[PDB]
Ligand binder design. Structure first.
Ligand SMILES: Nc1ncnc2c1ncn2[C@@H]1O[C@H](COP(=O)(O)OP(=O)(O)OP(=O)(O)O)[C@@H](O)[C@H]1O
Ligand SMILES: Nc1ncnc2c1ncn2[C@@H]1O[C@H](COP(=O)(O)OP(=O)(O)OP(=O)(O)O)[C@@H](O)[C@H]1O
Lengths: 114, 541, 58, 48
RNA sequence: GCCGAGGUGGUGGAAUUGGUAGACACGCUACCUUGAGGUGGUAGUUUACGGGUUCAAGUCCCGUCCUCGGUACCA
RNA sequence: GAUAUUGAAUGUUGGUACAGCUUGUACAGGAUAGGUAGGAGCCUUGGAAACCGGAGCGCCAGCUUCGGUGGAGGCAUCGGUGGGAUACUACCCUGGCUGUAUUGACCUUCUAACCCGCCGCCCUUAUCGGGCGGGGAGACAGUGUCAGGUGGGCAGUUUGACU
RNA sequence: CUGGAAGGUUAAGAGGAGCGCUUAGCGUAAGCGAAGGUGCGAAUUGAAGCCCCAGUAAACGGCGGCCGUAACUAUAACGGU
């Protein structure tokens, strides 16, 4: 294929990037822990850059070239992963900043120091 | 179909019954591997199936006659250079033919296993093909044996060689062969599971035995009271004596139930796993400087190995010496330690006590007892020094065998004990890890890390040296290469600096953008664009 | 329960176990009720499965 | 341990004799010359 | 008195003849850290006994002593 | 569980009975030589050198086939190598695809056997059963033989002597 | 008990490598011996169960020791194992 959508989910531990096909069929996937970083280094935006690089390498086989990147999850590695999809040979056209916002929904687990 | 069958095969020598009640099968192209402790008939079994040795009991039936026997130490092996398919093996592995006696130990098994593979064989009875091999030859073995005519039966001592090159395993154990098909990695998964089943069932019958003996003792201590506290009041003396009989009839019924369930159970206590404890001391107060080999040159007529290879190693460090096939590994230690065309200078400490280990097993005062061999001065010098060190470090009640009528998977162990008993403060291990066992080389892998320095560890393994390496001597073309790291690809000046600096500044700009995405608006964008383009420009050159 | 074609029925013999303990046991007919014309009409009687193989008209 | 030993002949192959020996004090296959009544003479026998 | 059980370092306690003043967790000692304690970090002390068997003994064996408990005189 | 009632299709992975043929280099070398025998010539207008495309292997050196441009050229002893000569014959089972016939196993699906303490009609004023017509299950189930496990639910029995 | 089941084992039925026995024949003897009949029979396949992995106690059942420590006169809130 030529076109797909890049789902980045960056949460406070991990930044998982799956480059999928438009009606949701994953070409290749790699996480920050898949690259090898096990500790807190999973949270650094360099691992998100590396994960976007590995997902870009995996996506260009049977292939695809022009992405459409959907940012999900509250984290840090969104900007480096969008930039690293560009520098790894792909094009990033649209940027959907879609973290799942509940309106009121379920109640969160308790705050931590209490 | 099968080709060779075994039934209740045993063997008797002057230690004890090595081997008993052995039931196994060789088939049409099985890759069968012997594992087992050394000295456990690992290669006596091969001489039984070869009919090289006649078994005391048991019937060994075979069908096809061709039995290729490739053993350890075939000791001035012949130079019948015939049936030239051997020379294909003798020239893939890069081994010259010209001699036998001046060859290193590394080449001679590759020149014996060569003649063994190609006489003609539908059945291979080979002892240990994985001693002194480099990985380009160790990998060549598996491509031989996968692309091979028939069945292979090997005694490996390798978890490495059997993950690729095994279909069955004939594990030798406590005097009994047991076979398991499929792999070696899942084989120990199978053994640990059967050990858990037998340990749970022995723990259950031992617990039940203690329970029924306790509830039998409580009834006895009641029957004694109930017999002694009768004849006092209320009812004559046989209404109360019958109650003692009523308890004492149960006290025997439960014992008969106990003995019957134990004769049906027959669940033995689990034999323990094998440990060595082995360790080391070498705690002598030592100086600093040990070995200065300057301007060395070694040649064999026109065969030139060393030329102007200047290296200097002092005390207290792990020196791994790696040669892929014939780098002179064995030759350097001889020309470190000796004369005979060490051309140049080899200076060594005069007061250092260099304890030497050989590759070749040809330095024994043969037909001597280990009693007379090992220096055992008075009383506990046999026990607390020596016999504990043997039995604890793999020996049976084998205090006096002739030491190469021994097992030959010992006699590396004899050298080893003679070193490590006495704290010699300098060791050089010219290929130790190949004759030893997966419980034997492991503890030498461990304690040599806790060893107090000055080690010269030649090892064709890649995983043994990961515990015993700080610096390397990679023998190569035109002499040595004293490495202190990987030292490949000639670590550079301009391009490496540009790459690391541009990547670190790139991660600076990326983290500065990604920490706060909407603030200090847009200098970071020009920064990252120019830095990424310049990184591509530097990597493009 | 006997077959209508041949006189094949339930007999009796022994359940001889190990230790040759003679228990007392019956032997049934593999009979398999099917539709056959024993008269001019079909009547759906018991048959046997020995007599059903290729011999008697369905 | 102590083992029952048959001592088969070599000229006749006939068994003809039993005595006991150790597996430790005599680990090798023992041989003697005894009388073979088929051979009607003294003959070297052999543990089998 | 009889039977059954255990007798190790200050403590509780594992050890199928193969190295233990102790191998394991605590105490204890000397130092460090702290204002001084505690925690924390570093190093340090012949198997109840006597006589064997053994190349080797806590273990295997023969005897003595102690303590738990059952089994008795008596109140 | 097998087997008998109990057969009709469509794929599957092994193996035969008839069949297709391809895969082959340690170095020296102009190269890819598996070896045993003949061997001084063969292939060409029913096409050679060369280019190109693709199935195919490859120890990526170079081979293998097929088709398409081309136009009379390839290729062999001998020359060299080295342990051994290149044009047919077979094999070697090292490493594939495709079809016919069965063979074993597995998955689906069908319906005509079997089953229906499902409906309607008739025998028939019958909650029996049994003929017909539908529906449902359907090679299962049930049932017979054979077998293993389970089985105090039941049965026959044993459970010593001196004192 | 309940659930799982990758794997080990595990029957009969299947399969039939082979080895006997007999025998025309070949062998001066000694012995070998095709085909057939027939006796036995290995490798392979072969479920449930069991081994294994989890849950279940208003299931069957089971529910500890010893040592120190407080103005002493004693116990131990406490600590160790
Ligand atoms: N020829 C022999 N005579 C008496 N005893 C022997 C002989 N060979 C070996 N032994 C004893 O039996 C043990 C086992 O010897 P075996 O034949 O199993 O060699 P192996 O152990 O198979 O070789 P490896 O040690 O490499 O496994 C030896 O270590 C020795 O103690
Ligand atoms: N004295 C000698 N004469 C001729 N050749 C020699 C001599 N010593 C060594 N060589 C050659 O040197 C080569 C390498 O031998 P070396 O001493 O490095 O042992 P190695 O290669 O490590 O083998 P191994 O690992 O079996 O000891 C061998 O091919 C050998 O023929």
């Amino acid at each position: 294929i030529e076109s797909g959508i890049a789902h980045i989910r960056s949460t406070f531990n991990n930044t998982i990037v799956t480059i999928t096909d438009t009606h949701g069929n994953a070409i290749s996937w790699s996480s920050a822990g898949a690259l090898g970083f096990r500790g807190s280094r999973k949270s650094t935006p360099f691992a998100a850059q590396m994960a976007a690089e590995t997902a870009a390498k995996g996506s260009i086989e049977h292939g695809l070239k022009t992405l459409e990147v959907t940012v999900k999850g509250p984290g840090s590695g969104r900007e480096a992963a969008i930039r690293a999809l560009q520098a790894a040979g792909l094009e990033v056209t649209a940027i959907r900043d879609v973290t799942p916002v509940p309106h009121n929904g379920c109640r969160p687990p308790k705050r931590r120091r209490v | 179909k099968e080709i060779v069958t075994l039934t209740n095969v045993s063997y008797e020598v002057k230690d004890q019954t090595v081997f008993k009640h052995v039931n196994a099968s060789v088939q049409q192209g099985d890759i069968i591997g012997i594992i087992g402790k050394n000295g456990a008939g690992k290669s006596t079994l091969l001489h039984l199936i070869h009919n090289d040795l006649a078994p005391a009991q048991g019937q060994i039936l075979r069908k096809d006659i061709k039995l290729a026997l490739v053993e350890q130490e075939t000791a001035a092996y012949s130079f019948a250079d015939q049936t030239p398919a051997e020379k294909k093996l003798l020239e893939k592995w890069h081994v010259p033919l010209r001699d036998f006696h001046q060859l290193s130990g590394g080449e001679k098994l590759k020149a014996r296993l060569a003649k063994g593979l190609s006489e003609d064989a539908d059945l291979l009875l080979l002892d240990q093909p994985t001693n002194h091999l480099d990985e380009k030859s160790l990998q060549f073995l598996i491509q031989q044996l996968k692309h091979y005519n028939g069945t292979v039966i090997l005694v490996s001592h390798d978890r490495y060689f059997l993950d690729e090159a095994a279909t069955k395993i004939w594990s030798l154990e406590d005097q009994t062969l047991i076979e398991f098909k499929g792999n070696y990695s899942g084989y120990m998964k199978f053994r640990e599971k059967k050990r858990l089943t037998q340990q749970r069932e022995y723990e259950k019958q031992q617990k039940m035995v203690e329970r029924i003996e306790a509830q039998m003792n409580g009834l006895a201590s009641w029957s004694e009271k109930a017999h002694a506290q009768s004849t006092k009041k209320e009812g004559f003396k046989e209404y109360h004596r019958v109650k003692a009989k009523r308890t004492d009839a149960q006290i025997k019924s439960k014992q008969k139930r106990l003995e019957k369930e134990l004769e049906k159970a027959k669940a033995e206590p689990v034999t323990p796993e094998y440990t060595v404890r082995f360790s080391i001391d070498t705690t002598h107060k030592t100086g600093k400087r040990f070995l200065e080999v300057q301007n060395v040159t070694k040649a064999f007529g026109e065969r030139t190995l060393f030329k102007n290879a200047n290296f200097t190693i002092q005390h207290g460090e792990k020196v791994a010496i790696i040669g892929p096939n014939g780098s002179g590994k064995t030759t350097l230690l001889n020309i470190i330690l000796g004369q005979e065309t060490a051309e140049g200078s080899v200076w060594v400490s005069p007061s250092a006590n260099i304890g030497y280990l050989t590759q070749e097993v040809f330095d024994l005062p043969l037909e001597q007892t280990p009693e007379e061999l090992f220096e055992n001065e008075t009383f506990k010098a046999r026990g607390h020094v020596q016999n504990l060190m043997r039995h604890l470090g793999f020996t049976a009640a084998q205090w006096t065998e002739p030491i190469k009528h021994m097992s030959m998977g010992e006699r590396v162990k004899i050298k080893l004990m003679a070193y490590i008993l006495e704290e010699k403060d300098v060791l050089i291990l010219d290929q130790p890890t190949n004759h030893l066992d997966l419980p034997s080389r492991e503890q030498l892998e461990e304690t040599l890390s806790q060893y107090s320095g000055t080690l010269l560890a030649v090892s064709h393994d890649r995983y043994f040296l990961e515990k015993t390496t700080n610096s390397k001597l990679v023998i190569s073309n035109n002499g040595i290469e004293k490495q202190l790291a990987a030292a490949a690809a000639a670590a550079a000046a301009a391009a490496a600096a540009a790459a690391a600096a541009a990547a670190a500044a790139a991660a600076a700009a990326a983290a500065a953008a990604a920490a706060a995405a909407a603030a200090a608006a847009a200098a970071a964008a020009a920064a990252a664009a120019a830095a990424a383009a310049a990184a591509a420009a530097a990597a493009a050159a | 329960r006997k077959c209508v074609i041949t006189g094949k029925k339930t007999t009796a013999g022994n359940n001889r176990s190990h230790a040759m303990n003679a228990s007392k046991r019956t032997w049934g007919a593999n009979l398999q009720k099917v539709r056959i014309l024993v008269n001019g009409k079909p009547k759906k009687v018991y048959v046997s499965a020995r007599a059903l193989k290729s011999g008697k008209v369905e | 341990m102590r083992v029952n030993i048959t001592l088969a002949c070599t000229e006749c192959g006939e068994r003809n004799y039993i005595s006991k020996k150790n597996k430790r004090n005599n680990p090798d296959r023992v041989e003697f010359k005894k009388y073979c009544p088929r051979d009607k003479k003294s003959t070297l026998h052999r543990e089998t």
